[PDB]
Amino acid sequence: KTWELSLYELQRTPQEAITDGLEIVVSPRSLHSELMCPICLDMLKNTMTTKECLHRFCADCIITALRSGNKECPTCRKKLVSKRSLRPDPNFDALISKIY
């Protein structure tokens, strides 16, 4: 990846925050599959993220998978040397703790 910016991108301006009290309908989470872990199909909990490919799992599930001896990523099958190959992210955690 070059990270070349296009003509539009060189000129783009912010997308301002919606600050008026608007509520979001999140009654079902069959609209938000990005908050569910691919292994256990639950709300991601203590989210671990792979450095190289940015796939997210519960700490529980990804440690187990690595401990099984299988070094591939469960989502994209790209190699992982170890647990130094993933980082925790409190951002996703805190996001999920607000929605459910």
Partner 1 sequence: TRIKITELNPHLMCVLCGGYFIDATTIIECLHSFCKTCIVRYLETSKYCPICDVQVHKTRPLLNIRSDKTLQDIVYKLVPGLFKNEMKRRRDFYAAH
Which residue number, 10 or 69, has a Cβ lying nearer to partner 1? 10
Count Cβ atoms within 10 A of the Cβ of residue 66 and give its class: 0-12 exposed, 13-18 middle, 19 or more buried: buried
Give which of Zn ion, partner 1, none residue 73 binds (C-beta under 5 to 8 Å, depending on kind): Zn ion
Which tokens belong to 92? 């996703």
Distance, in Å, from the CA atom of 99 to the CA atom of 24, rounded to the nearest integer, reads 10
Applying CB under 5 A, which of residues 37, 48, 66, 80 lies at the interface with Zn ion? 37
Distance, in Å, from the CA atom of 31 to the CA atom of 52, rounded to the nearest integer, reads 26
Distance, in Å, from the CA atom of 60 to the CA atom of 63, rounded to the nearest integer, reads 6
Say if residues 41 and 35 touch (Cβ distance below 8 Å): no
Binding mask 72-91 for partner 1 (x = CB under 8 A): ---------------xxx-x
Binding mask 6-25 for Zn ion (x = CB under 5 A): --------------------
Residues lying near partner 1 in the complex (CB under 8 A): 1, 3, 5, 7-19, 21-27, 31-32, 34-35, 49, 51-56, 87-89, 91, 94-95, 98-99
